[PDB]
Symmetry: C3
Subunit: 387 residues, 3 copies
């Protein structure tokens, strides 16, 4: 509504760098279409998980499969307000697809906003639309951007972002917060009431998407967001799980990106936060056995403060006993816990639908992030206005 | 034969939690039917390898594909003497399948024996059949059971087992030995002659099933089982291999569960054992180059004591020269090893058929575990009797 | 022409043990046919990546799919001058395939050369064609050869090779250089003018084939070859990447073999070395950012010395500005870097062809190694003559 954005997808694009923008932009009220040359709506793109394990370069792994919702060569550029270019290993080959470069050129002339991250810039270079343009990218793309005539801004840190009129660029997904806020501002958006402090309850093997997307999305808004995990210091990292359906009766499990806690668990002053968020995956099942974690949940529910849990997150809510006489949804399987917890089941159909019950927001699976964050914003007083 | 048990399978059930009971029980003269809702006999289910590597929860990878030998919608519960519920991530979604809960309800009413392990209990909680019943499960399931009115027994160790009449529960597959024996006694079985000490010759990359299945089946019988490996002590652990036939000309390989040795290899004495078991996999080929390992094999052989090796295990035997003028079978490829070793080949058809020559029991692949353990029991004079 | 060789392939053969000879022999003017029982030209076999990681035996991983260029049951064994038998897990089941054992025996009967490595020797043992023959193989294949009546040579080190008239044998791929040379001489081939020092610019996640095949082909030729990596000692190792197309719009990625460096990067002296080789994969993009790396490339190019780059290696040339007014090809996607670098693009069609622009040799991908090496050989004046 009011704004429509087009994301340029491709095989092996960085998981994070495609889903975070796809869902955040939606949670803010922007329609988003995803396309990939030679593919139609409903088709799938494999994705890459780029991370660092102590080598001179990043290590790669397979992320979730990403389904396109729009068809390439059937898109009317005139009908889009902005364009986003994901990173990973897709730009490398997309940057050499005639129809892709023609598209980025055409859009580039309209003067409309273009947000490119990591290796995405390579496409910009091929289209030769960066001359004299200030900009940044993954350190490795610098030679190509300088040779393209760009005003290269070396990324001293993974988070640095750069703007030059309608050209927004980022080095890595660590800069998603600012990357996204700028593309929003660039779309004529205004964010209000975003001066909140949210606490995320994390743990080992939490769902990759279910942590990153909600987390960064809330950061792009401007909130101060912290994440903790029992027995871990503000530097520790948590391994994540990538849950996806690949044909069998239940989802499959694969290693995702490594997540970094921001605060120490022991030094946690719950009263200082305006909200609490619980990611799903396999972490909730063991976090729910933790006394300290439960008390934290109790405090937020007692204070009638906003609480947003997704997927298996509700397992911690049911164990806190805070679901009694409460309406909510969860991952289809954890309906067991909701009922046993004393809550009233809300059918999660479609799977992307989330529900609000007073101070309680719940989601079923990662496909519900748009409504998930959107409804947590409402309980927070955060709005995003355009036109 | 005399009893018939039913195993409730599902996609991503714990590989060990299904294969060990499925094969140990057959080894004890019990017919076992495997079924999964929405699937027929001959279909397969992917399994999960749940293990620990230091994180706050278990790690997960894909195990062997498990082929069901029964059909769900064609089952008559009035024909089974018992029911086994394996763990993994299957209980989670099976618990929310109306037909599954109905089967547990009815089996629950008949009062016949029900053995549930790890996450399996979640199904019992769903069917509301644990009210006032003592029982245990993976610590994580504790909450759900309590809310289902169960008398919860927290697992202080990974092998704790509970029994409240016809209900038998275990926390992890590390409790299989007692889990199975209790299930057998509940079916009215009596085990006699299990006053034996057995020695296992392990090594890195031995087959996953080919170690745990025989090792745990023997323990469930009551035997004392020791496992060793050159240059490794009691606490040490060996990486295992998961060999499975996918669509190629030979089997593929994946990591299996890590296996824990029980005794220091140097502190051994062939004297104190009544039989020697040799797992297959890739451990044999290099184990067969070890002096000490060969002497151990020789001692057991000329002492005429019972010796059982499956799959590639027969390589150690050939290298020890103890297959001189003897009949035996092995993984098809190891026929060269048997012949060049001076043995007479026995066609491994069907793949689950094992052969006993004098004091020597041999099998082809892991599917022959039932006949393998059965035949080893026969040389040890161990028996299981019902009715 | 002059010589034609047949290579016995099989599912799960060692990836290196097939590509290195398959390609190195073609770069030496020898026609090579790959064949696998029950498979026809155009079919493919999965390969296996073997090497140690701190365990008692090797670890296995999946390597590149290998497509056969000939049909087994259509081979006129009479028109072949030599036979190569790769290792890995394939021999194990091939040794038990009648057609295969007869082919081998029929070939050992003609006196013609037979090069076998690692586990390949098991096939010779099955054919009983090694009596009183001096030879070596992978340590665990010794007991079999001894029993087949061979004069076993324990591989004191992994790089040992043994020649006994027409039977050339090696223990591991580490001995490929000597292995290939001996086979070539035994084919009546002479190598002249190979006294050259060659430098390889290596890094983390370079294409597995792209470093090993060219590296070892030049070593077999007699050249002294060094491998370096920024800030890494002679003992350090580099992880590699296996890039392969599996159906998506761009290649996929798996871990390959670890590659050890030969000299220290800091003590490197560009003065020596007659040529420079730059492997592809993901290492270039980050090496292209290293000042030191660009100087080395600078030096060579100024000296007019032969420079050979393949796949993504050109990203380093382009960055050093040495493509200015040079004609060359590269991996399709990296055309961007070639054009931005001021070079004239040479279309890599067919994918396996390379080009020579003065002192510059460039290839598109690993499928082009044959022309890649023969063209570097031409600049260096190295020749292989037969008849």
């Amino acid at each position: 509504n009011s704004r429509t954005v087009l994301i340029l997808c491709g095989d092996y694009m960085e998981d994070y760098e495609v889903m975070v923008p796809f869902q955040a932009l939606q949670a803010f009220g922007i329609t988003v279409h995803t396309v990939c040359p030679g593919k139609k709506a409903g088709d799938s793109c494999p994705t890459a998980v780029h991370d660092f394990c102590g080598h001179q370069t990043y290590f790669e792994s397979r992320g979730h499969n990403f389904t396109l919702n729009a068809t390439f060569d059937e898109v009317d550029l005139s009908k889009y307000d902005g364009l986003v270019i994901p990173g990973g290993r897709a730009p490398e080959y997309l940057a050499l697809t005639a129809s892709v470069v023609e598209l980025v050129k055409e859009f580039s002339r309209s003067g409309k906003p273009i947000a490119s991250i990591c290796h995405g810039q390579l496409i910009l270079a091929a289209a030769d639309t960066v001359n004299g343009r200030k900009c940044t990218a993954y350190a490795t793309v610098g030679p190509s951007l300088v040779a393209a005539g760009a005003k290269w801004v070396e990324p001293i840190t993974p988070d640095v972002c750069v703007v030059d009129g309608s050209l927004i660029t980022a080095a890595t997904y660590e800069g998603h917060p600012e990357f996204i806020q700028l593309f929003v501002k660039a779309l004529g958006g205004k964010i209000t009431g975003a001066n909140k402090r949210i606490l995320f309850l994390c743990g080992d093997y939490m769902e990759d998407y279910e942590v990153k997307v909600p987390f960064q999305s809330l950061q792009a808004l401007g909130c101060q967001v912290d994440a903790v995990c029992p027995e871990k210091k503000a530097g520790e990292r948590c391994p994540t799980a990538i849950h996806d359906f690949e044909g069998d009766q239940t989802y499959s499990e694969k290693p995702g990106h490594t997540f970094a806690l921001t605060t120490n668990f022991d030094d946690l002053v719950s009263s200082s936060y305006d909200a609490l968020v619980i990611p799903g995956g396999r972490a909730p099942e063991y976090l729910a056995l933790n006394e300290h974690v439960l008390n934290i949940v109790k405090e937020f529910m007692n204070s009638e403060k906003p609480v947003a849990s997704i997927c298996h997150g509700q397992q911690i809510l049911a164990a806190a006993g805070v679901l009694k006489g409460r309406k909510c949804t969860a991952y289809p399987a954890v309906k067991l816990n909701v009922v046993l917890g004393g809550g009233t089941w809300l059918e999660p159909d479609p799977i992307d639908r989330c529900f609000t019950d007073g101070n309680l927001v719940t989601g079923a699976a990662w496909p519900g992030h748009p409504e998930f964050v959107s409804q947590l914003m409402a309980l927070l007083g955060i709005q995003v206005s355009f036109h």
